[PDB]
Paper text:
The acyltransferase (AT) domain in PKSs is considered the gatekeeper domain because its function is to recognize a particular thioesterified extender unit with high specificity and to transacylate it onto a downstream acyl carrier protein (ACP) domain. ZMA is a polyketide/nonribosomal peptide hybrid antibiotic produced by Bacillus cereus strains UW85 and AH1134 that exhibits activity against a variety of Gram-negative and Gram-positive bacteria, as well as certain protists and plant pathogenic fungi. Our analyses also revealed the existence of two rare PKS extender units aminomalonyl-ACP and hydroxymalonyl-ACP, and the AT domains that are specific for them, ZmaF and ZmaA-AT, respectively. The structure presented here of a hydroxymalonyl-ACP-specific AT expands our understanding of AT domain recognition of ACP-linked extender units.
The crystal structure of the ZmaA-AT domain, along with its N-terminal ketosynthase (KS)-AT linker, and 20 residue C-terminal post-AT linker, was refined against 1.7 Å resolution X-ray diffraction data. The ZmaA-AT domain (residues P93-S407) forms an α/β-hydrolase core into which a small subdomain is inserted (residues A226– I292). As is the case with the two KS-AT didomain structures from the DEB PKS, the post-AT linker of ZmaA (residues D408-P443) wraps around the AT domain and makes extensive contacts with the highly ordered N-terminal KS-AT linker (residues T1-H92). In ZmaA-AT, the highly conserved histidine in the GHSXG motif that includes the catalytic S192 is replaced with Y191 to form GYSFG. The corresponding residue in our ZmaA-AT structure, R217, is positioned close to a molecule of formate, which co-crystallized with the protein and presumably mimics the coordinates of the C3 of hydroxymalonate. A notable difference between ZmaA-AT and previously reported AT domain structures is the positioning of the loop reconnecting the small subdomain to the large subdomain (residues I292-S298). In all other AT structures published to date, this loop is positioned away from the substrate-binding pocket of the AT, whereas in the ZmaA-AT structure, it extends into the substrate-binding pocket. ZmaA-AT structure features a hydrophobic patch in this region, instead of the positively charged surface as on the malonyl-CoA specific ATs. Neither *malonyl-CoA nor *(2-RS)-methylmalonyl-CoA was used by ZmaA-AT, whereas both *malonyl-ZmaD and *methylmalonyl-ZmaD were used to some extent, highlighting the importance of the AT-ACP interaction.
Numbering used by the authors: 5 to 292, 296 to 443
Write the structure that this text describes.
Amino acid sequence: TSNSRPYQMLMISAKSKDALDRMTLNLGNHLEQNPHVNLADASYTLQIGRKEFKHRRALVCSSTQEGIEQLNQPDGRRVQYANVKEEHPKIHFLFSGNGSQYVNMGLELYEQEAIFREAMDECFAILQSFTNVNMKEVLYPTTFSINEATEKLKRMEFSQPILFAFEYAVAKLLMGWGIKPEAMIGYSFGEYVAACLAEVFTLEDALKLVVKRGQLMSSLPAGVMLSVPLPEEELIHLINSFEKEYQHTISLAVVNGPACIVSGTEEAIVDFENELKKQRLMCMRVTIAHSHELDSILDEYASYVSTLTLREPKIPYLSNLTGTWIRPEEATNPVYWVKHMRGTVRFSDGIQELNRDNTSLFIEIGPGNDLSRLTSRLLDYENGNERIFNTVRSVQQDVSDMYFLFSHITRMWVTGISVDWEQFYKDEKRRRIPLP
């Protein structure tokens, strides 16, 4: 209980950069001079009940020696620094869509963080109760080999509710640390998690809904998705001509600003790729849908959604169908959910609405490097990175999950996002100690 987390964030703030840098160097020297100081107590002393000033520096370490090395170089790029100009920034959660999930994603958070673990275990209990499947064995295998869990995570009736649960739990972890969204937006499937957090549906009904969505989609052959670097109005013209010249349908699946994603069967997409080649246009497959291929399951989906309870949102969020704020009467209409399945995802429109306040800050919930890069570019071509913060590493990134999360929380905090340290320390026994 006096034990602490395996990573520690050190927070320092001051009324000028000069004072901040002197304090940073003083703290480094103090830790070098007393190398047995309790690092968790030092971290706690710098956070708990503390006034936060506008020049801020923060870093992550896992040992006193690592903290010393960083503090001795205050302007080193391992360390985060910013001068807060907006003290109460708008915080937006951005929910990742399907496609980047992997076995054991978030494992260190499941192991270490009570808030996260509790949210995940609630989801696993609800899923087991109505599906009779233990989905924890797939996400965090303790009897299956990773090989077998990976194969089972490829089935949509598993991957969709698992991603949903994971993103829900990440969001509850941040909210449980006092990081609350002023507004939200999902990329495609991510809208379902936004809606649950806005209390459009209960966690139980959301989990039933996404299991049903996954089950229905499992009956569909995989099609293909294709990125085309032209704006919406141009894709509309290309698709219209294509459908009249070939005997195939192409759906405009996603609008991402100056580029769009289209989708269809392999046959349709190969013909479309041929037409693009005739027009000497770039394209690239990006298959991971939102298309004509869903039409045969929509009636059944509509019927199911009609059985759930839908309520008006309590946190505002963007609609992927309309590209603007969801209306109360839209969220509560079962037909909205059916249309959302079939319809174009107006992602760039939603991001443009949020970016009307160009000091707003975005936290990506769930894994997805491509989505983070796209969003950054839509916020600001040179400097969008400074306003987006991630939560989960990509499958191939060999980095600790808690390290990755805390690296981004240190960035959030220096940029002006407050953390409820009382909740952060709710399961530890810490003491304030003397510091320079």
